Ligand SMILES: OC[C@@H]1[C@@H](O)[C@H](O)[C@H](O)c2nccn21
């Protein structure tokens with residue numbers, strides 16, 4: 001029963017600065033692996049470390065990068081060569097072609113045309129095995145590149161061993177940051193040299209310098225194979241040596257099988273059938289991408305118990321730790337997918353978040369590996385509360401709540417996206433003003449209002465004092481403070497209470513983040529009825545929604561000074577101002593359900609699924625973003641979506657396959673049966689749940705978990721009478 005066959009690690013690699021089709025690299029890794037491995041086509045330092053259109057590989061690199069924008073840390077590479085012992089990253093490079101390359105989650109192989117070498121690699125969570133097949137040559141070499149900005153290398157010939165550390169990073173690390181690595185060869189060195197800032201030094205054992213490296217050599221027969229066992233650690237060499245045991249004594253074939261098994265274990269929790277090969281590939285590739293971030297950032301001590309280097313305070317402490325995710329992205333549906341299908345994994349992650357707070361003073365928003373300045377909002381609140389409300393409960397609930405309250409009245413002194421920038425204005429006025437030097441003020445307000453509803457939900461659940469509950473119940477309505485009755489849109493508001501003038505609904509950034517008013521107005525996840533009312537009723541609301549799709553993709557880009565890829569991605573799509581390639585508008589289509597018109601959602605969701613996702617190297621319509629854009633497709637292909645994390649609800653869309661089966665960790669299974677599904681039959685004519693007629697526009701977490709069968713009768717005509725009743729509507733705070 002194999003699903004890995006459908007996973008294309010190359011999907012999203014054909015991307016540029018100007019137009020993203022994913023901005024991914026081939027992550028050769030275990031699910032949520034501490035260390036990822038990738039072929040490297042880019043130069044050292046370039047966020048675009050692998051691009052499909054590149055012709056040369058120059059190394060096989062350990063990487064932790066979550067995006068080309070955030071860039072990398074804990075990074076070093078290995079490169080087999082023939083002829084001269086050359087360290088230079090250009091001179092050592094080799095031409096290759098994609099037809100000479102095999103990429104899967106558990107195994108990567110490539111043929112290096114300028115050296116006549118085959119490279120294979122199979123990783124575990126923290127370690128990896130390389131196998132190099134060399135040609136007949138007197139002078140065959142392996143290059144180890146510890147990268148620049150301060151590193152260390154040491155050759156240990158009595159053990160066919162090279163060790164070292166790397167420090168090049170992109171911010172967000174303590175002063176003592178190091179990644180310690182160990183490499184063991186099965187073949188003795190006949191040549192050895194370390195490299196000091198590009199200068200080759202034969203029989204010198206050790207370097208401590210800006211850019212350290214090593215070159216070892218030997219004679220090879222035709223087809224002779226040399227294996228290299230590699231592990232790394234954020235704690236020490238001794239711990240890197242312990243991590244190495246993950247490999248046991250396995251060879252390439254045995255480790256590949258183990259990795260294939262670990263991926264089939266997780267991918268196979270969702271079985272789809274009755275689709276075409278494009279759909280299978282697109283689905284499972286998206287699922288693979290949803291099971292990578294945040295990465296494990298903990299290691300195992302001698303008793304098999306988790307310990308971690310703190311990317312927050314630089315100490316080595318007990319317990320879980322994860323990193324490399326921006327909650328601004330992944331609150332939306334990535335983490336919800338974990339709460340539905342992988343709750344035991346999120347349990348580890350949530351414990352890790354308690355540790356971020358204890359070690360740093362704040363919950364993270366963007367972490368890579370420590371706090372990084374990027375995006376907006378206080379959406380850790382959604383993550384933390386959603387997990388708790390769906391039965392993923394940390395040990396220390398006391399600290400959990402305190403951490404949440406802390407975030408509402410503090411901003412990190414060095415990292416402005418950590419905590420709530422503008423909390424003082426927000427707490428006092430009910431919004432962050434447009435004219436007080438706090439950029440992206442309207443986006444901050446709207447997301448905080450939602451984050452406060454999340455806190456309200458937990459405070460109520462925890463039976464906090466009525467005063468606290470009331471405060472957050474009030475703050476949750478702060479989205480009303482930026483609604484402009486005249487345009488029916490959200491609008492920047494001045495400190496004096498006047499609306500910002502002149503108002504451009506089509507202007508990106510400024511008051512908003514990477515979007516305009518037409519994208520951000522819909523950010524009222526917890527109260528769509530409230531928004532419906534603000535607009536003057538469901539008919540007007542639907543009119544506003546339809547117009548998003550109907551207009552040209554005209555924009556105003558003056559806040560950025562250039563057509564950023566996010567805007568360009570939107571212009572080429574021919575779907576009006578529906579900017580699906582970015583996060584803010586991603587839940588929007590599901591809002592049709594709340595207005596009593598689910599057939600419109602069914603239509604537009606099928607459009608997006610068919611057109612905006614392809615399984616090739618240019619498969620996405622914009623940045624993939626650590627699982628968010630991928631997990632969107634996974635949920636939407638299943639036929640539902642967590643519009644409002646922190647509720648128990650999944651809002652109905654339209655399924656893509658004829659059959660889908662979910663295998664929950666509790667041992668129950670759900671069958672979603674849509675036997676008449678096709679390219680033409682994308683409307684839901686009727687639905688039943690275990691025999692009972694089901695006309696509601698939503699499904700509940702605990703009902704899903706019980707198991708059984710959902711039957712969906714597909715049709716090529718919209719049913720105008722189903723899901724229009726009040727009791728069919730999903731949750732709105734205003735009705736509560
Ligand atoms: O990757 C960092 C952030 C993302 O978290 C976010 O999705 C945003 O769209 C974006 N554009 C460029 C970089 N970023």
Ligand SMILES: [Ca+2]
Nearest residue numbers: 582583623625
């Ligand atoms: Ca994005």
